[PDB]
Design a protein around this ligand. Structure first.
Ligand SMILES: Nc1ncnc2c1ncn2[C@@H]1O[C@H](COP(=O)(O)OP(=O)(O)OP(=O)(O)O)[C@@H](O)[C@H]1O
Ligand SMILES: Nc1ncnc2c1ncn2[C@@H]1O[C@H](COP(=O)(O)OP(=O)(O)OP(=O)(O)O)[C@@H](O)[C@H]1O
Ligand SMILES: Nc1ncnc2c1ncn2[C@@H]1O[C@H](COP(=O)(O)OP(=O)(O)OP(=O)(O)O)[C@@H](O)[C@H]1O
Ligand SMILES: [Mg+2]
Ligand SMILES: [Mg+2]
Ligand SMILES: [Mg+2]
Lengths: 236, 236, 236
């Protein structure tokens, strides 16, 4: 069927190549998994720089008998990890802290410069002893580069992931995903800068709650086209 | 009264011309109207680029017997529109979805480049079949230009509106309103760039809830000076 | 002990000087104090420009019998201050409005250009009669300069504060803290601009609630290294 197949091939190529267009978004899905198997996904998109910033209050599992906990209640629990004996808790809040964090990156990403910073519970640079004096961005460990794990993007050649296991303490997150400009053109240079600046931080973020991973796969990953890897190394 | 009238005229001109000053804000009021007549207004301001980003959870009517619904409850309802059978609802959530969206723009706006993007329920570019691959900003349809409707600004010569009717599904919003630089000066060029960047994203957003449109007119529009048009084509 | 003291001195200098590094954050703590002595702290950090924006709903004391009030309830109270008879209240909401606002700035700050704008209840420039026409940023009064009060930073030579007393009406806040580039190098110039832009707005904000000031000192100030001054002029 020469021309119906040609037409199919062109439609495939148009979908596969679309992310490399000027103003086509790079895509970031962050998934937090909790001990009982619930998943919280946070989606961020931008063509130029994704800035995926998540407070530690926003990373806790926050549902309680069908009701959403307040930032105040969640921050009260987190404080006990930040500042010794700063709350009244006599048992940990490990049940609501992520077991694991998954970062799914898709599109025309500069993989040399994508930065994923797991920061401490109140947003300071992670360290044994956090302090306003030693608080910075883009620490060397944040640049994952070839530590990102290739995943199928079904023809895009443009999806990778990074996984991290937490050890029972709350964290915040700062991810910076910059656009691949390795074609030699600096989109920030010359008159185009005003247009690039106008496009930063323009796309709504979306937070979703799932009672388990299959729900996450069925109603997020496979609905929109982000391949994810489960604990058995099976892709969905 | 030559000089008391001269003084009046100068005071009029100073108020009327103020938006054209460097660091004077352009103003964006987005109003969502719901079936029972409630209005939710979202106000954004900036001198250089207004970025008016609204999640679909933030656009639902979220009050319930005097109590505000959680993002979680609202997002649970919206999911059924995004992902087939992703929630347990047996009836629609049309009662809490906007009937209509109104966008009021006032100030020294570049009307050739102002962009209003009605995006899908989870923030992806609107299309019959939304997907991470075909997710972008500043789609051609977003530039309204002469589809904006002139409204009185009482001497500013600087207010226009755009209206859109929804059809029962939830949406998110991304608006970019850039400053008119048609006097030939690029505020992003040379040393002034650092100062322009310092001014982006500095003004608090304000969300207001009204049980009906007259409340919206009385306690928002006429209080601060944004002319609005009702369903009978009367200005307030 | 020549070399153990040399080692101590070098460790002191490394902590004291760290904020002057490229990508080292400037730090902003805003503290609101309320009539019964509760404190709400808001922490913002960035290397290049801190943009510390706080809605008037976010500045009210919002805890009520251990539960967090909704933005809707808080905004309903604030509206009565913005727009005469726009709510049903027969008594003021002074109990939940700050008595006083404290701004703590630490790091490599340009003290000539740091701007602190106490804006009106709905985000407009503060004035007797607020209006969309006379809404701007960086008003002359916002530049505090030598009105900032030096505080000990324990070797950094880099902490200052500004204090303001409110008079029973709600306000919003916009603070811009730009990086000291008085070494003669414009970090926005040339190829480094893309990297500076990638770093803006990347660090999680953190809101904390304290029942009294000693809690604020014990579990925030002294935990992380921000010196604060109490009503008796004692530093903590
Ligand atoms: N179960 C799995 N676990 C881990 N990695 C996998 C798994 N399956 C595939 N991958 C990895 O994904 C990458 C792409 O594989 P493949 O070529 O099959 O995908 P594709 O559909 O062609 O999409 P793309 O256009 O991204 O290549 C490979 O590096 C592959 O090893
Ligand atoms: N009821 C209405 N419905 C739709 N458009 C209207 C209505 N009334 C006025 N307008 C439009 O608003 C625009 C400005 O009108 P007008 O000159 O009366 O306002 P103004 O007070 O002078 O303010 P400005 O300085 O913005 O002109 C005109 O294009 C006018 O047609
Ligand atoms: N109780 C106080 N009230 C107001 N200001 C104070 C108080 N104590 C100290 N300061 C001010 O703080 C500034 C720095 O003082 P000092 O040199 O003692 O601090 P330091 O530990 O050396 O830290 P730095 O490196 O910031 O100087 C001085 O201007 C000082 O007057
Ligand atoms: Mg392949
Ligand atoms: Mg006119
Ligand atoms: Mg000193």
């Amino acid at each position: 069927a020469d021309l119906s197949l040609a037409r199919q091939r062109l439609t495939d190529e148009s979908v596969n190549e679309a992310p490399r267009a000027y103003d086509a978004n790079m895509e970031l899905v962050i998934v937090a998994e909790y001990p009982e198997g619930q998943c919280k996904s946070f989606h961020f998109a931008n063509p130029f720089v994704i800035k995926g910033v998540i407070k530690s209050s926003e990373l806790m599992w926050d549902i309680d008998n069908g009701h959403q906990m307040s930032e105040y209640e969640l921050q009260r629990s987190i404080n006990g990890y930040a500042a010794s004996h700063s709350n009244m808790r006599q048992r940990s809040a490990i049940n609501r802290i992520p077991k694991k964090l998954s970062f799914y990156l898709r599109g025309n990403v500069d993989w040399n410069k994508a930065s994923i910073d797991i920061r401490g519970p109140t947003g300071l640079s992670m360290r044994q002893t956090e302090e306003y004096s030693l608080d910075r961005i883009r620490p060397p460990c944040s640049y994952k580069r070839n530590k990102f794990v290739d995943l199928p993007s079904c023809g895009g050649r443009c999806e990778k992931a990074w996984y991290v296991e937490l050890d029972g303490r709350p964290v915040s997150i700062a991810v910076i995903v910059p656009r691949n400009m390795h074609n030699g053109i600096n989109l920030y240079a010359g008159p185009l800068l005003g247009n690039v600046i106008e496009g930063l931080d323009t796309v709504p973020e979306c937070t979703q709650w799932f009672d388990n991973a299959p729900e996450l796969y069925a109603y997020h990953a496979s609905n929109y086209g982000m391949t994810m890897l489960d604990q058995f190394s099976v892709i969905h």
